[PDB]
Amino acid sequence: MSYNYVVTAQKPTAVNGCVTGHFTSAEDLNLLIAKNTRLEIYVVTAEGLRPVKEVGMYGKIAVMELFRPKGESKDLLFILTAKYNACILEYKQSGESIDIITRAHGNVQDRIGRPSETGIIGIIDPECRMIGLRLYDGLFKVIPLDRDNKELKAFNIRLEELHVIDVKFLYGCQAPTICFVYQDPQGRHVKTYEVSLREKEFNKGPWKQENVEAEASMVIAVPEPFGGAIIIGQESITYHNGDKYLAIAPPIIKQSTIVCHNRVDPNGSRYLLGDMEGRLFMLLLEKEEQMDGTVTLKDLRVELLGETSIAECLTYLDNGVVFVGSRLGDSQLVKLNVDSNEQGSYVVAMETFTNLGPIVDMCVVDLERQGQGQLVTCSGAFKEGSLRIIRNGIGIHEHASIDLPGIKGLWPLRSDPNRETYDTLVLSFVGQTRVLMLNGEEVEETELMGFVDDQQTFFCGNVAHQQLIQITSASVRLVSQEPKALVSEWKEPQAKNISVASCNSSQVVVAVGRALYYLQIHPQELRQISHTEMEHEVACLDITPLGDSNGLSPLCAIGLWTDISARILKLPSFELLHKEMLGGEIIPRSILMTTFESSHYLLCALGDGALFYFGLNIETGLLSDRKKVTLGTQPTVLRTFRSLSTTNVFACSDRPTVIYSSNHKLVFSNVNLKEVNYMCPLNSDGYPDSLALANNSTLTIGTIDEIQKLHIRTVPLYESPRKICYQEVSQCFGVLSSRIEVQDTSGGTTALRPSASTQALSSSVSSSKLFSSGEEVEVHNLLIIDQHTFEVLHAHQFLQNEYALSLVSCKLGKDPNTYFIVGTAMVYPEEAEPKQGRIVVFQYSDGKLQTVAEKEVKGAVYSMVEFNGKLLASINSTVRLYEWTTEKDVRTECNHYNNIMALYLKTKGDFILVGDLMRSVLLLAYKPMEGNFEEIARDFNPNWMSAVEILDDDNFLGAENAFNLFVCQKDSAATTDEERQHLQEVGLFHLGEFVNVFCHGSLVMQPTQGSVLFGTVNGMIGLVTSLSESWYNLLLDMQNRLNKVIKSVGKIEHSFWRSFHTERKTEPATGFIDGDLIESFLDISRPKMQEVVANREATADDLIKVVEELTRIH
């Protein structure tokens, strides 16, 4: 009986794979980007990447290849999952809908076999005769491509070589032939076999096993024109083919290992090479033509081209463009030129995509000190290290604050017919109208000609022909720029009001009730045109001359009031077209027609806060999509605002919301604001690119943030951040950091570039004498980062070979100071495990960093929380509790010894603690007895932990080694000595991510209990919450209903995916819910959504409301 819920807050952003080809059309260039469980399909364009399709799969993508057999009009896609799900995919565009269809699938894991060296490798023959897998040592699995084999049946062949580094299929080979680098005793070797599938054996390869260098790792199979194989080692590159043998050993490449490649030119004249450094190389093969003799290979050379992000994945695209898949850093779109720039680089970045990278550690802070957490991650590694500040929502910056408990509308006002700046904001009021002349930045309420102050303005637009309108309770007044008085003024042929106002900068379309007139601000006078009567009372109206119309406006739309409807119409005629019947007893408060890039949009807000959304047609215009949200609980006013190239829709509610744009879609993110009642663009000479926004009581004006649901602000550290703490009193962060350095010829160590610790504002080194006794090395630092500016205020460098692994910001003992304590450790590469380390206690003062105390240890300090005014640490395998002498020193109180390796600890308010490396988790208490540890209980399973949390008094979350999550609790049980001494795994669940950090916090607010945020190696940020048994049960059920209804991509079974799994056991998931899947619900059609129900009560869209309520936890 454990009941948890897990959702993704941020999808993985690291890039594991990327592959290029024609997957969308025979004539289309696509870049397929593989995150972890996310496949991203693009079309390469002049601008770069046209997003087209983003699906998620039920597994971690380990293999991703495009291929095209015969008769096949375009490329199909092969994908192997890490749980050995193999599938084959096809891009299907049902004219206007899109689908990725599974042409074949099946699971290719084998009970036999130990997962090999260099991990899964999936290759595919040039002729497409088969697919070659290397899942295990000794085996080589072959999946024969045939029209059938829709279940991907496969055979294994025995592989004599038990240790294969890399393999490819050779080109221009009659028989399917593989080429591989393998390792034995006495070096590495390149060797070949034909693959005859009609016998299920191998056969001899075309060329004799040559040798390759000790560190050979990549095999490139050169295309048909050249044929053969390139082998890439350290400091050396070689070419093999039959008796042909070519070798270069360019000094330049010794510096760092080549990690990745890519064919640039189809013939393979040219390849890209990726470095551990981020260096980019061109590999060039000098061809050679000899009449009556196809071609040969005279030479090959390497040229340094420049520098990218550390590249996992490289892919030449169109002309000089290269996509850079990055895992340690931000991914990027990059450009190659024939000419280098200034210090010498042929590489020029074009676009950078944000990778929250490896989140190595993180922490929550409301920096703005409101009631929302921002989250602050140590990210990336080496040159890509960064902090990322992550903040939900879209904010605005407030410039004035005028108390006006009334404002019932407001429109812009340029008082000078030249400047695109306005100096007035005439504003509807509680049955009034106030004008507002501005002295630039100042505020002033005065009169204005032909604009009634006694009456309630319902509009105020920017009517052309040198005129200013003010439509009122009564009727459309008129004022000039030239005359500036009472130029004209309409009035209802009966002394009845205008109910609903309209106007763009050229039209006027009011309503009287059921009535629908039409007036014009023609040169200096308002002339009448049409009149039509409607079934019911006009609720709301919209007109704006969309695209192909200068001021004068095409078709129309309206919501009415007893038949709560929205309908499509024309202009002077009012001829009714298609329509829609929305439900309930609440009338449409607002209707809208818009545009962004390539669609004309229609939305309709109701008084319950909900909104229905649809698209119209400038040419025709009819019905579109039908979905239903929950923005405010209050009626929503829709409006459109000035921003970047794509100006957008702002929704006014108790939950202010922006509606931007996705692919060609539209964003739905919160605006970080109390409540916005009405809202409009502005620009005054004293307030430019400003937005105006009145609430219950107050005008406000300011710019906008980004757009997404999450805003991220990066602090480039240029080295690898490791741990991170917030010392509030000091208004700064502590960050442990590590920089790499190389052996000097003095013997010392230099540095490869300026980092955050070398460009530090001030600085200091360890003096401490506790110890006495090319080549690369780490230099470690505590950095002091201002919380507002994110400047490195101070840098404290630790000793030669001292890694700093843990950090806390705490007060200790009676002592009233907040210290920064750092646990460290002396690492020497030969050693298995450090035997020496220290704890160091520091204070950061006015702007100072004092070494307040040190403390020898006989190990590596892995973690340390602040217990109860004491410092609980943890060294190599011993867990301790330090007391702070009044004499200001850390002295031992007690220690627990029964650990293989204590890596993590957390503290449940009370005297309770938890953690371990290969042996899952322990629970400990502090006994104010003799002041001792009592080991309360442990989990008796072989979990190699990576992260540990306490969700509550009895519930412990755990993440491990194998991308699983688990929960333990203490066994409430008779025989309270053994059953008591044991805690049971009451929840299991395969996440699919490696978790580095849990911490309590949330990114949201100012059903569910708790909020635990987690930070993963892939850039994925998730959330774990707790549930009621009934909520659990509701959701479990609905989890299963949902799986019947939803087509999973490669036809992977959801529950196969979520299955707690190791290469020693596989159990199904218990006590866990992916809201990821629950949430999936809303993307479903109401038909397929009805099925989800057939059965305290049962409903058809009660659940639609349960699920909404959830999406808002993050």
Partner: peptide, 13 residues
């Protein structure tokens, strides 16, 4: 050196 391995593990593969 297992400390180095763990540091490597946090940055994965």
């Amino acid at each position: 050196n297992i400390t180095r391995d763990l540091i490597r593990r946090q940055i994965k593969e």
